[PDB]
Amino acid sequence: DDELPVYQGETTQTLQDYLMWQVELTPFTDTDRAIATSIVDAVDDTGYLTIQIEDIVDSIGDDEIGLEEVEAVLKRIQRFDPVGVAAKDLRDCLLIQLSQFAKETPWLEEARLIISDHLDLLANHDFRTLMRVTRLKEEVLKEAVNLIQSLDPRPGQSIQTSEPEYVIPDVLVRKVSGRWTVELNALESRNDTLLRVSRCIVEQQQAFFEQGEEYMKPMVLADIAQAVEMHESTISRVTTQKYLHSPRGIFELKYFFASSTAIRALVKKLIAAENPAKPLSDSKLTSMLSEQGIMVARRTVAKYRESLSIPPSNQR
Amino acid sequence: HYIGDLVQRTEVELLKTPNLGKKSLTEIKDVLASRGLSLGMRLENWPP
Questions:
Q1: In the Cβ-directed half-sphere of B1, how many Cα atoms lie within 13 Å?
Q2: B47: Cα within 13 Å, side-chain hemisphere
Q3: What per-residue string of b and e applies to A15-54 under the rule 16 or more CB within 10 Å gives b?
Q4: Are A263 and A300 in contact (CB under 8 A)?
Q5: Which cysteines form disulfides (chain B)?
Q6: Phi, psi at residue A171, to the nearest 5°?
Q7: Which residues contact A216 (CB under 8 A, 6 or more apart)?
Q8: In chain A, alpha helices (H)
Q9: For A76, which of B11, B37, B40 is closest by C-beta distance?
Q10: At what angle do helices A30-40 and A15-24 cross, to 10 degrees?
Q11: CA neighbours within 13 Å on the CB side: how many for A175?
Q12: Is A76 in contact with B40 (Cβ distance < 8 A)?
C-alpha cells in the first residue's frame, strides 16, 4: 500500500547497470550500441571476464559485422569507469590499466609494456632468467614490478554487495566439560515443536560425534532416525534450513551429520610440512595412511589432499 | 590537421569520399577507439 516505507526497493546499481549507464551517454551508432549492449552483459561481477569473443561476433548472426568492429568498440567499452574493465586474460587488463600511467612515470612505461605484454607467464615464480631476457638488473625491474603489483584486478569496486549475509545463528551450543551442551538461544506450533526436535537431534549429534576429536566422528542419519524415529529427509531438512551455533566451529550442523573430515584434518597436518616440496605426495601420504591402517592407495582421500586448491599438481 | 577537426564528423558524412571504403572507416574506428574514443562533439572553437 502507500504512505509508509514499505519494502518497495532501493534500485541499487551493479557493475553491469553502471556500465550500461555509461554506454547510454557515449557517441555510439545504432549498431555499435547493439555491440556495446552485447558486451556489457557478458561482463561479470569479477570484471575481467568478457568470456568468448568469437561468440560475441557470431551471436549477432553474421550479415557483415566483422571482428574488427566488435574489437574497437570492445576496447572503448574496456576504457570506461573502473579503468580496466572486461578485456580478457588479465594481460590486456593490465595493458589497459597501464595504458594511462600519464607517460611521465620514470622507467615504468617501457619496462611495464615488456613485462605486462609478453613473458608475464614466467613472472609468477620470480624474476630469475627473465632478468637475463630483458637485460634488466637490480631494482630497475623490481620497481616496475612494484608498479605491476600495485595495479589491483579488474572492477569489484562497483560491488553493490553491502549485504554481508550474516548467519543469525539458530541454536547455541554452550561449551561444557570439553564438549557441548544445547540451550537453543534467540500448524505453526507443530513446526516450532519440529524445530525443537531438530535441536534435540543436534544434541543427539553431540552424543553421536565427539567434539574434542579431530574433525567429527563418522555418523549416519540412521542414528538420528533411530533416536526419535524420524525420517532421514526430515532431519536433513531441519539441519539444512537452520544452522547450529557453537562457541568453536559453529556451523549449520548439516555437515555434522573420523570419516573424510578426519582425513582432511590429516591432510591439513601434511600441508603444514608440505611447503618443503611444491609437488607434494598425497599418493605417498596414501601409502602412509595404508601403513596407519587407512589402506589409502593413491585414492581420492589422498587426491582430496592433492585437490582443494592444494600446492599438489598446481606446483607440478 | 591534428585531431579535433577530424573527431567531429558523423560516419554517414565520412563514409562517402573517394578511397575510404568500409575497411578504412573501421580502421580509423579502431585506432581512434583508443585514447580519444570520441568520433563526435560540437565542441566550442579553435585556438589556431
A1: 2
A2: 2
A3: beebbbebbeebebbeebeebbbbbbebbbeebbbbeeee
A4: no
A5: none
A6: -130, 130
A7: A209, A210, A256, A258, A259, A261
A8: 15-24, 30-40, 54-58, 67-78, 91-97, 108-117, 129-133, 139-149, 188-208, 221-227, 232-241, 259-274, 282-292, 300-306
A9: B37
A10: 170
A11: 9
A12: no
DSSP A44: B
Cα distance between residue A3 and residue A226, in whole Å: 54
Cα–Cα distances in Å, from B26 out to A68, A144, A238?
Answer: 7, 35, 61
Which candidate, A178, A208, A182, places its Cα nearest to that of A195? A182
What are the respective helix, strand and coil percentages of chain A, to the nearest 5? 45, 5, 50
Structure determination method: cryo-EM
B30 φ, ψ (degrees, to nearest 5): -80, -45
Task: Give resolution in angstroms.
Answer: 4.6
Distance from CA of B9 to the nearest CA of A (A): 11
Name the residue facing A29 among B11, B27, B34 (closest C-beta). Answer: B11
